[PDB]
Short mmCIF file of C-alpha atoms in Angstrom, two decimals:
data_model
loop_
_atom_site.label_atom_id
_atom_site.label_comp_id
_atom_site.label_asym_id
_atom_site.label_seq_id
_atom_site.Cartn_x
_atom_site.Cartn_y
_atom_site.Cartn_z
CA UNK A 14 31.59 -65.53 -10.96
CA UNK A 15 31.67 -61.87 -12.56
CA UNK A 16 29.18 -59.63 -11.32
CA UNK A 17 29.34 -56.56 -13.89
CA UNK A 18 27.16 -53.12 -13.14
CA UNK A 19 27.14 -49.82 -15.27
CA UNK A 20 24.97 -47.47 -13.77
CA UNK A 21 24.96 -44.40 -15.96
CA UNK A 22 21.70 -42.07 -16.19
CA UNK A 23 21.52 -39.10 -18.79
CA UNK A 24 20.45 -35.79 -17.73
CA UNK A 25 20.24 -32.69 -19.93
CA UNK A 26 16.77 -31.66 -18.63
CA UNK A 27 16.42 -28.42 -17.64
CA UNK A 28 13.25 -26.72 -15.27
CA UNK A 29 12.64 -22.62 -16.34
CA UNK A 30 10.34 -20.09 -15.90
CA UNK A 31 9.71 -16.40 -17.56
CA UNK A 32 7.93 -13.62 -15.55
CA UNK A 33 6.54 -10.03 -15.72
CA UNK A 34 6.78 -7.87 -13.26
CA UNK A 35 6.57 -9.74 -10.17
CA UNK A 36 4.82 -7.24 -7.12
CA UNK A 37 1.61 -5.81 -5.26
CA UNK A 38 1.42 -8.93 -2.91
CA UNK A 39 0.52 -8.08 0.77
CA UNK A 40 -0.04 -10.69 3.86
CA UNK A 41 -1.74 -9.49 6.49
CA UNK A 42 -2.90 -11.63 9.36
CA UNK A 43 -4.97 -10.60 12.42
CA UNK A 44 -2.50 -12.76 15.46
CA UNK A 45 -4.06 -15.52 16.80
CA UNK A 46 -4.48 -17.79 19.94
CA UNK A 47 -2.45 -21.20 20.91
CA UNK A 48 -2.21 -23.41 24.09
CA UNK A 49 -0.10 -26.76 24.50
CA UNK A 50 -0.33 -28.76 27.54
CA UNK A 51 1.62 -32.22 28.37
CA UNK A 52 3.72 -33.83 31.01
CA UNK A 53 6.14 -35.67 29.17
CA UNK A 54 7.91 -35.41 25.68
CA UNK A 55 10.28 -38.50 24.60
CA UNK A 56 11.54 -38.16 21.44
CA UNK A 57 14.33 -40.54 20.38
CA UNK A 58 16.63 -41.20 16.77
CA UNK A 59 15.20 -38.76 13.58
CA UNK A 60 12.43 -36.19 14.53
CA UNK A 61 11.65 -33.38 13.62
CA UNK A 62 8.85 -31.63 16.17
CA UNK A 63 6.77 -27.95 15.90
CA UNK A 64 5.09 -27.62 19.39
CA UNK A 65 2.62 -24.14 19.69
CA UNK A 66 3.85 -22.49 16.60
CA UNK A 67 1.78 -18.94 15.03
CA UNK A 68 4.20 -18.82 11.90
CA UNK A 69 3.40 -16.13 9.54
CA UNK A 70 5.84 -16.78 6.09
CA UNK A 71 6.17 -14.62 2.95
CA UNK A 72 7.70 -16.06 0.03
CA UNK A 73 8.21 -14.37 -3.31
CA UNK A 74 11.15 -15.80 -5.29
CA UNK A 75 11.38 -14.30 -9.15
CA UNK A 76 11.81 -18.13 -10.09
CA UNK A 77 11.60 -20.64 -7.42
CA UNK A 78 12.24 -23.82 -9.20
CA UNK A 79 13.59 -26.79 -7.94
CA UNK A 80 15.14 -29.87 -9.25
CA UNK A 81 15.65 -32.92 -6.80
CA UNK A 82 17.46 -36.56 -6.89
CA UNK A 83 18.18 -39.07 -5.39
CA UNK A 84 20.84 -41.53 -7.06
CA UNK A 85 21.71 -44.37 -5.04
CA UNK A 86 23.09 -47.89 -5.84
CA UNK A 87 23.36 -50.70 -3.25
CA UNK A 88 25.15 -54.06 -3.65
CA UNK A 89 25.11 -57.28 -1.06
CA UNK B 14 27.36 -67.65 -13.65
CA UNK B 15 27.84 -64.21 -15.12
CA UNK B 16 25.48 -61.07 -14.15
CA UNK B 17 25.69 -57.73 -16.23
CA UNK B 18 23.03 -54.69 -15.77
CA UNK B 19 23.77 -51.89 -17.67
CA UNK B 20 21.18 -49.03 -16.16
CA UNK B 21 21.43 -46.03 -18.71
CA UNK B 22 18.27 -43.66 -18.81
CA UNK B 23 18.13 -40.83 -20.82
CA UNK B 24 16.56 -37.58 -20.15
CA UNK B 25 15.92 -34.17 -22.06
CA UNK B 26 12.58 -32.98 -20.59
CA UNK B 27 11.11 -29.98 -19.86
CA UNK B 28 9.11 -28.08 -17.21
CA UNK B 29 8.69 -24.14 -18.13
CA UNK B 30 6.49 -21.82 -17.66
CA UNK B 31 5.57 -17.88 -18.88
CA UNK B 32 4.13 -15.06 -17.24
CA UNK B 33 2.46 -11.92 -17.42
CA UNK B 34 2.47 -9.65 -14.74
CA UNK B 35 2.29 -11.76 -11.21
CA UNK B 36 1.03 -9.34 -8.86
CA UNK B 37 -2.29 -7.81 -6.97
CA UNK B 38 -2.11 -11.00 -4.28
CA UNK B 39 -3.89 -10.77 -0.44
CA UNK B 40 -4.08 -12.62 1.90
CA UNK B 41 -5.54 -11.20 4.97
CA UNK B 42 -6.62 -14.06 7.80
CA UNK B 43 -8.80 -13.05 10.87
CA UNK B 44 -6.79 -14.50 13.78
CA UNK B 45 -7.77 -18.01 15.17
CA UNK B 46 -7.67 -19.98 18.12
CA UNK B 47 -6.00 -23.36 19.27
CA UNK B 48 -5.75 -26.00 22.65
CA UNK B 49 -4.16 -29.41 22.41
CA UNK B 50 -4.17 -31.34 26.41
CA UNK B 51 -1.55 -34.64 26.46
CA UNK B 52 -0.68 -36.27 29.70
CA UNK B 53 2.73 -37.88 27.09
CA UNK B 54 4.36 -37.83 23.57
CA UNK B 55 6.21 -41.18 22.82
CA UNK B 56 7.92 -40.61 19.20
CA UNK B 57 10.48 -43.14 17.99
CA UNK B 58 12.54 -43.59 14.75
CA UNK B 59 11.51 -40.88 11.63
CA UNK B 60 8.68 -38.91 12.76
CA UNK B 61 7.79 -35.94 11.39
CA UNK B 62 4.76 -33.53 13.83
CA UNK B 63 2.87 -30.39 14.39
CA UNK B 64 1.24 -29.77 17.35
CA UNK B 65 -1.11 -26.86 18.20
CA UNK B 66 -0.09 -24.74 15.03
CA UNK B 67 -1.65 -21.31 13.81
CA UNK B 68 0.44 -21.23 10.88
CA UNK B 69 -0.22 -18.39 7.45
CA UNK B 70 1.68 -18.84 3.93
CA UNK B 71 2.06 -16.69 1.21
CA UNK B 72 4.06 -17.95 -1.66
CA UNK B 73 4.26 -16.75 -5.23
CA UNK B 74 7.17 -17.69 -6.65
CA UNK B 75 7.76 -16.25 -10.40
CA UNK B 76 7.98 -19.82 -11.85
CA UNK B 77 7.68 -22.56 -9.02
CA UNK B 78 8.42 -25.55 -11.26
CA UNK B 79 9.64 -28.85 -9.99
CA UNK B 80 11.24 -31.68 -11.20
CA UNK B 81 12.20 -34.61 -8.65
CA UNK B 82 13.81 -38.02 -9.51
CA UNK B 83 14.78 -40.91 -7.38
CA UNK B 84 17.69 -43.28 -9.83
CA UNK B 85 17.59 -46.41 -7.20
CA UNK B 86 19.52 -50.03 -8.03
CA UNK B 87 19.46 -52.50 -5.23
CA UNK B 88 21.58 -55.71 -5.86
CA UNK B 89 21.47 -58.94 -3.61
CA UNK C 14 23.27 -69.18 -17.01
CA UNK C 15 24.17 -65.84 -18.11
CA UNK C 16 21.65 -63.16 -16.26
CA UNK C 17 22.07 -59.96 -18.80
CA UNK C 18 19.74 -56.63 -17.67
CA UNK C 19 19.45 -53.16 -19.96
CA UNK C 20 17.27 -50.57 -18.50
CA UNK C 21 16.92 -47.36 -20.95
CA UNK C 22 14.11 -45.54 -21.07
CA UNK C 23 14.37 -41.90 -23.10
CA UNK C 24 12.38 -38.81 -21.88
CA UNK C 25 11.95 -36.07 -24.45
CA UNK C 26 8.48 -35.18 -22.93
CA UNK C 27 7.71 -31.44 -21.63
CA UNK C 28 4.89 -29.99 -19.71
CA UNK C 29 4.91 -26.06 -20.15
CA UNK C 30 2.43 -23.63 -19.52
CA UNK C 31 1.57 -19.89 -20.74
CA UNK C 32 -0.16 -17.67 -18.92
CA UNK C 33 -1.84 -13.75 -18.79
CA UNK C 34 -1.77 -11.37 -16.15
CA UNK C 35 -1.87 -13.66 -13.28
CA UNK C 36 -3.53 -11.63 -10.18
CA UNK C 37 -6.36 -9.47 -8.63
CA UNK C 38 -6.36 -13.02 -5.76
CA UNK C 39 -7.82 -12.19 -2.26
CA UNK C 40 -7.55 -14.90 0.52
CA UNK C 41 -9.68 -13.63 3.64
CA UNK C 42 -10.24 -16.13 6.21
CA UNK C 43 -12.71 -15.35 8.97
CA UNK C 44 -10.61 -16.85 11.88
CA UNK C 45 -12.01 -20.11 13.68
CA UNK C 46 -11.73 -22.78 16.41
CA UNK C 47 -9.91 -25.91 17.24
CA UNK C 48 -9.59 -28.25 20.31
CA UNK C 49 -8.03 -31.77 20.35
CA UNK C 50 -7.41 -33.91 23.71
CA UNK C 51 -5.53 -36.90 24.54
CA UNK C 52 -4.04 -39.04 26.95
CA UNK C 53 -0.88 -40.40 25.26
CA UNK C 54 0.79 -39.84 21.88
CA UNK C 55 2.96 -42.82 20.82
CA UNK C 56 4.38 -42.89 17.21
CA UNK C 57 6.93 -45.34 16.27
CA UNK C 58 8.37 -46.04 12.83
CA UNK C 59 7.69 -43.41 9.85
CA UNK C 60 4.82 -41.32 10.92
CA UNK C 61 3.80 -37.81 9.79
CA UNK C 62 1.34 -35.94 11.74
CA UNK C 63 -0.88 -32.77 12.34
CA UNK C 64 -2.25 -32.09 15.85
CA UNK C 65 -4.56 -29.13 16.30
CA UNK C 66 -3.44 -27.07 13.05
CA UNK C 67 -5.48 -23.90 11.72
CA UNK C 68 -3.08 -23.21 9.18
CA UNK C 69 -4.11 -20.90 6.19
CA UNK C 70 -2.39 -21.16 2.53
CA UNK C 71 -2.18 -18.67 -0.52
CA UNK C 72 -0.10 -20.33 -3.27
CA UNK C 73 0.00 -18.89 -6.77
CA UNK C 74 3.31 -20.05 -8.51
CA UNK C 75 3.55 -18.13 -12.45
CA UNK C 76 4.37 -22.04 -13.27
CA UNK C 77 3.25 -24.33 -10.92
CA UNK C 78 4.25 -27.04 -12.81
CA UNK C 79 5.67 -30.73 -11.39
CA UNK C 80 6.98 -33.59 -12.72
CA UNK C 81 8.22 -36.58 -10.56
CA UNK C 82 9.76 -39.52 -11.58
CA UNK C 83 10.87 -42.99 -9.77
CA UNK C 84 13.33 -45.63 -11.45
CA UNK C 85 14.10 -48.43 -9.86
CA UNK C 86 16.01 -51.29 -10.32
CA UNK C 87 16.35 -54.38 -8.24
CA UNK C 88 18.00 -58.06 -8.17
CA UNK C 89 18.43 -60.85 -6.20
CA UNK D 14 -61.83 27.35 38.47
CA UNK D 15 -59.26 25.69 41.10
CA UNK D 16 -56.87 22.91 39.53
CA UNK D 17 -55.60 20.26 42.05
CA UNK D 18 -53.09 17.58 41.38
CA UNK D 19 -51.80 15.08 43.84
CA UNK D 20 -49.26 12.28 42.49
CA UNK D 21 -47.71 9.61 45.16
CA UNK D 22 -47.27 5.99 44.14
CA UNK D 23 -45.87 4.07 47.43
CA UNK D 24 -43.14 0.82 46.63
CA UNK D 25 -42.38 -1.11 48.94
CA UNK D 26 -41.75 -4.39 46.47
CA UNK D 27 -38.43 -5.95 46.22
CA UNK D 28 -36.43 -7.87 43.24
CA UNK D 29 -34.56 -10.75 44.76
CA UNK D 30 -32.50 -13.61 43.81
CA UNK D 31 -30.70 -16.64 45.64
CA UNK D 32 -27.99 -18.54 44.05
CA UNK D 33 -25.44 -21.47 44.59
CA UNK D 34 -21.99 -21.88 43.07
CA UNK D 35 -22.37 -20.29 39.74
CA UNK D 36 -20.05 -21.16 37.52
CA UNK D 37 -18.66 -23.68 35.36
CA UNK D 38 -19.24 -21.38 31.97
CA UNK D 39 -17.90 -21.50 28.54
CA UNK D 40 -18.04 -18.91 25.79
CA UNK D 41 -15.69 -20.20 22.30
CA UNK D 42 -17.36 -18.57 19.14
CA UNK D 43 -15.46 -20.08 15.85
CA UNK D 44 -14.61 -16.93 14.17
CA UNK D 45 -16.82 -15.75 11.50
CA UNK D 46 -16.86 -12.88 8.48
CA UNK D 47 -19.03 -9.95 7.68
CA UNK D 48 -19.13 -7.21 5.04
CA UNK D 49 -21.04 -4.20 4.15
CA UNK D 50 -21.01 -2.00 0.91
CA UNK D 51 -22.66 1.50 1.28
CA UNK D 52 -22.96 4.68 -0.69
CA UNK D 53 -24.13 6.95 1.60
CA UNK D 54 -25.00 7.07 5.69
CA UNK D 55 -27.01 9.86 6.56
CA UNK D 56 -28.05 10.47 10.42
CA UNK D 57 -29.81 12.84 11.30
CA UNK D 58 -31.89 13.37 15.28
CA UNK D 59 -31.87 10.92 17.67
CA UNK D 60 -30.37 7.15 15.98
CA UNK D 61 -28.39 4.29 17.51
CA UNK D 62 -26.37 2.32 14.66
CA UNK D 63 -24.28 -0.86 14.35
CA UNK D 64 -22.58 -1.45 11.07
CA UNK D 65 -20.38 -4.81 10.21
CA UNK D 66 -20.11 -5.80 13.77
CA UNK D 67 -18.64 -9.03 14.85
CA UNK D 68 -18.96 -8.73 18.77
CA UNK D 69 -19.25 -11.59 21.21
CA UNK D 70 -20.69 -11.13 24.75
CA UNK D 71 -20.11 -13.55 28.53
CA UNK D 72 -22.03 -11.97 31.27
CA UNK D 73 -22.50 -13.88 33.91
CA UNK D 74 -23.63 -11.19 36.85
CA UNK D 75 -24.11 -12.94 40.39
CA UNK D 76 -27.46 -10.99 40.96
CA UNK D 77 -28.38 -9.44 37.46
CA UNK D 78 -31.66 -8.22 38.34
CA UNK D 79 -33.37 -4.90 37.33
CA UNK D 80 -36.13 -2.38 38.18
CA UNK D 81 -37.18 0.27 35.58
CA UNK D 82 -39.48 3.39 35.91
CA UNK D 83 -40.36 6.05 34.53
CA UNK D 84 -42.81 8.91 36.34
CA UNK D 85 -43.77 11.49 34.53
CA UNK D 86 -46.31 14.80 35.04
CA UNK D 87 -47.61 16.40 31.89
CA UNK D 88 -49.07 20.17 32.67
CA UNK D 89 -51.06 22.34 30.04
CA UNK E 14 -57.46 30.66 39.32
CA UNK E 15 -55.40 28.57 41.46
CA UNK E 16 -53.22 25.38 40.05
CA UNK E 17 -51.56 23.35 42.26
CA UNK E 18 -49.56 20.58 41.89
CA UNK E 19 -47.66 17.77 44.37
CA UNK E 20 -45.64 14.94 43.28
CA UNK E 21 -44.16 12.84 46.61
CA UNK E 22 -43.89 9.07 44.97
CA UNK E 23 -42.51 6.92 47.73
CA UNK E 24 -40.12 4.59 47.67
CA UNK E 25 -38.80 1.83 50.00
CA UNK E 26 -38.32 -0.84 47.28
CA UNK E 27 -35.20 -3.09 47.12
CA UNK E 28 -33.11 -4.75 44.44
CA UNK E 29 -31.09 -7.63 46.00
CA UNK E 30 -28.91 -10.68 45.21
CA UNK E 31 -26.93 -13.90 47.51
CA UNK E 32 -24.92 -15.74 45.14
CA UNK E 33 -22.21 -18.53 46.29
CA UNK E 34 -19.39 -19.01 44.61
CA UNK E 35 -18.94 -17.18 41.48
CA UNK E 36 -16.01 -18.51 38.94
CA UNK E 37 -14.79 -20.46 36.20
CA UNK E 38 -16.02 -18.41 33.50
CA UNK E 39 -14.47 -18.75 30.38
CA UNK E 40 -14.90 -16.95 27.51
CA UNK E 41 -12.39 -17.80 24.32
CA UNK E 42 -12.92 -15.68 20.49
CA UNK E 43 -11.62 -17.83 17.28
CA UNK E 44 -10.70 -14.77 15.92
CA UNK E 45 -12.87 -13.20 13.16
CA UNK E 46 -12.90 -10.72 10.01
CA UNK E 47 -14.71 -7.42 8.96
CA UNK E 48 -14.80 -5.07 6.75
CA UNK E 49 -16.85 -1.88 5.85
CA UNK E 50 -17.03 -0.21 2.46
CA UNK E 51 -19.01 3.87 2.37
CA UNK E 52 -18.04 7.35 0.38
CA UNK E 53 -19.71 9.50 2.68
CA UNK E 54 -20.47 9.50 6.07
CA UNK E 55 -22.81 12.41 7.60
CA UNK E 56 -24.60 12.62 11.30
CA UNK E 57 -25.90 15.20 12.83
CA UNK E 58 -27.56 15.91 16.38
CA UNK E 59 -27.31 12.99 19.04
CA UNK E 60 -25.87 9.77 16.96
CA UNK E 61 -24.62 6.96 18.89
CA UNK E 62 -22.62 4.62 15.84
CA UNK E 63 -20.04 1.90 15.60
CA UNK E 64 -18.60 0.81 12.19
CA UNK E 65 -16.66 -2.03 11.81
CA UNK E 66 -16.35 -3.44 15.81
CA UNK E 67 -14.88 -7.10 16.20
CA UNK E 68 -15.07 -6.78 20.20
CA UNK E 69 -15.10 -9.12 23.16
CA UNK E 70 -16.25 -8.73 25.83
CA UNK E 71 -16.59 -10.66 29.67
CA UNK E 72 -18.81 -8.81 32.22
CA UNK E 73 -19.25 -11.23 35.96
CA UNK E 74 -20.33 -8.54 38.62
CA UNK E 75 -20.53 -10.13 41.92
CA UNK E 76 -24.33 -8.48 42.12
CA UNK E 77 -25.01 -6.40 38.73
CA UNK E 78 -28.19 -5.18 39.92
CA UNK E 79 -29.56 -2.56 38.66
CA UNK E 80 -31.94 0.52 39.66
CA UNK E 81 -33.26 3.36 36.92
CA UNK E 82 -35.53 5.97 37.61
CA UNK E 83 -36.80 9.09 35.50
CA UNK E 84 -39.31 11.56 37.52
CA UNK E 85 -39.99 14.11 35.14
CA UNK E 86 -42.38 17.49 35.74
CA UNK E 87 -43.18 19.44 32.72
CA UNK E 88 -45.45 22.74 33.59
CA UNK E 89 -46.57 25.17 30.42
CA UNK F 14 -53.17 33.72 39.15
CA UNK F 15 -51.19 31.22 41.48
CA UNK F 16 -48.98 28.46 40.85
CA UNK F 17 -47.96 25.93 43.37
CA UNK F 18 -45.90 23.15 42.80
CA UNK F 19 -44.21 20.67 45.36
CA UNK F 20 -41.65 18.07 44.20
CA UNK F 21 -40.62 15.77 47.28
CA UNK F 22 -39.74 12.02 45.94
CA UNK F 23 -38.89 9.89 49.01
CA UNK F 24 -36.02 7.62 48.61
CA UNK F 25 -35.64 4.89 51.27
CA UNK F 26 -34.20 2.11 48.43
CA UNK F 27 -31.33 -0.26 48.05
CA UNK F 28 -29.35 -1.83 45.88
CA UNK F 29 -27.52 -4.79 47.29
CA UNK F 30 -25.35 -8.23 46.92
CA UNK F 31 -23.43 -10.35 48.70
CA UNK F 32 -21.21 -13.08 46.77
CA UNK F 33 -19.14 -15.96 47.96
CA UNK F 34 -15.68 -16.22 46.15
CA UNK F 35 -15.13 -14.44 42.91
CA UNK F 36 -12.73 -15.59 40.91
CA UNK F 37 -11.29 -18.23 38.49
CA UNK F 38 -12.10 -16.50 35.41
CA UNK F 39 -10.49 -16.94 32.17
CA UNK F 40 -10.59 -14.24 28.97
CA UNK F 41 -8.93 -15.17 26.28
CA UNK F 42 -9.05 -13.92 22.07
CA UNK F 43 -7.71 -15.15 19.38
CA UNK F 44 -7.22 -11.74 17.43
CA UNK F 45 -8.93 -10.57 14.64
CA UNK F 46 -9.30 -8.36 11.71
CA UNK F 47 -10.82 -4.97 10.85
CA UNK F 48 -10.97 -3.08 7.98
CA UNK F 49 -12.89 0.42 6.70
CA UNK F 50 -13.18 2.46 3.91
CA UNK F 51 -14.76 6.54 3.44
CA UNK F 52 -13.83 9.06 1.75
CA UNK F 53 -15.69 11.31 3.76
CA UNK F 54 -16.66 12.44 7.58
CA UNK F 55 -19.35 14.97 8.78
CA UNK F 56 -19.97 14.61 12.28
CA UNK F 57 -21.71 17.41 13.83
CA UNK F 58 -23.17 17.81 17.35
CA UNK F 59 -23.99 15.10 19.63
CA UNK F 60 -22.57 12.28 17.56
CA UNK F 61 -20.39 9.05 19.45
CA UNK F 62 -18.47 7.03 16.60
CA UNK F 63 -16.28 4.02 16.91
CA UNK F 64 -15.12 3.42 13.74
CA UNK F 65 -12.41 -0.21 13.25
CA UNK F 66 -12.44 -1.13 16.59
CA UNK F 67 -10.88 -4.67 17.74
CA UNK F 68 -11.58 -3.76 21.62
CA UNK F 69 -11.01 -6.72 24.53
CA UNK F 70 -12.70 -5.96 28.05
CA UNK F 71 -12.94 -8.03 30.81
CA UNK F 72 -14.87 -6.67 33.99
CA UNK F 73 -14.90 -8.62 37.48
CA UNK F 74 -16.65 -6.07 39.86
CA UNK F 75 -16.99 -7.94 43.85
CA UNK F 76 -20.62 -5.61 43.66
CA UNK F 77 -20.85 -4.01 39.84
CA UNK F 78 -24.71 -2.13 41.23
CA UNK F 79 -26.23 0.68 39.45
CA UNK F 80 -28.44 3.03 40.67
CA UNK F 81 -29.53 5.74 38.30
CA UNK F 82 -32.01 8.80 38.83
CA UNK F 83 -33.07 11.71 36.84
CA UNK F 84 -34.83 14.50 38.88
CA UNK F 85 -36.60 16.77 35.94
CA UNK F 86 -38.49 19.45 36.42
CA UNK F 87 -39.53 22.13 33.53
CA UNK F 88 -41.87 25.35 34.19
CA UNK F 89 -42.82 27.57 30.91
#
């Protein structure tokens, strides 16, 4: 028997952003302390692990947007 | 017997933003302190971990907007 | 028996913002403590986890804005 | 007329101590924050000051005692 | 006419410790934060001052006795 | 017109300690942070200052004993 799919989404959206002057931002931390103890680690298939981190990030894109998908179709 | 979908959505949305001046930010954290003790870590299939962190974020980003989607058809 | 599906929606929404002078922001954090002790750690399937984090955040997008959006479709 | 003076305390005492193991001592201050706003400071003779301090102390001596005195002989 | 004058304070005295074992001792800061705001600052003749400290500190003398003695004549 | 005046303080005194082991001591900061504003400094004679200090100090003397005399004498 037919088996008929059109799968066909419609996208003119659009993600935007107007600024001034973008500046005078200052980060500034004072260090830190970290211990981690263990005997064993196992990690097995998809992980993703942060063991003892003292991250310091600055991040100052003039637009920083995102747009995401996912399209997926799956047929049995 | 005969099966037809016909998936089709339409989209012209939006996100925007304006701005004045972005600016005159701190951020200015006094140190810390961190212990973790395991005797073992056992991670299997998607796992996603921080251990012990002492982690500081700035982020000013000029817009910062998001738009995220999943399209998903599953047939059976 | 004929099975017909149509899946359509339209999106002409927006979400939009205007803004001033966006600034003078001070983020001072006075340090602090943390301790965390185990025996084992044993995570299996999709787990996300934070062990022992003193993680400080200064976030101040000129939009900011979000908009998420699932469509699914499935059949059987 | 003749003037006589005689001064001679005698000390034989004693500050003692007897200890076992000492030990098994912990110090973890969480952080904290202080300010101060001022005009004007404005020291004049003999001062001891502490302004916006944020000091933490362990002593732990294995004797600690103390003996004070003062002698003192006033003449007109 | 005659003044005379003897000072002869005696002494035998003893400050004194036993301790056993002295140990684990720990002493472990979260961090902190300060600050200190003035226009002027002025002192004059003997000042002792500290302005915006954030200090640690572990003191474990194996005795930390201690002995103080003024003897003080003043004639006119 | 005579004066006499004898000053002869007799010292037979200790200070003393005995310990078993010293040891197993742990100092350990996380950070810190310090800040100070003036626009102006007058320090004149005997003044000390510390001004934004972030000081550490660990001290482990096996004796650590103070003895401390002042001898005065003053004829006008």
């Amino acid at each position: 028997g037919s088996v008929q799919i059109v799968y066909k989404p419609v996208d003119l959206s659009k993600v935007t952003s107007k600024c001034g002057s973008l500046g005078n931002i200052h980060h500034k931390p004072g260090g830190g302390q970290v211990e981690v103890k263990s005997e064993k680690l196992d990690f097995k298939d998809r992980v993703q692990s942060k063991i003892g981190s003292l991250d310091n990030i600055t991040h100052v894109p003039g637009g920083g947007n995102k747009k995401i998908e996912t399209h997926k179709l799956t047929f049995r």
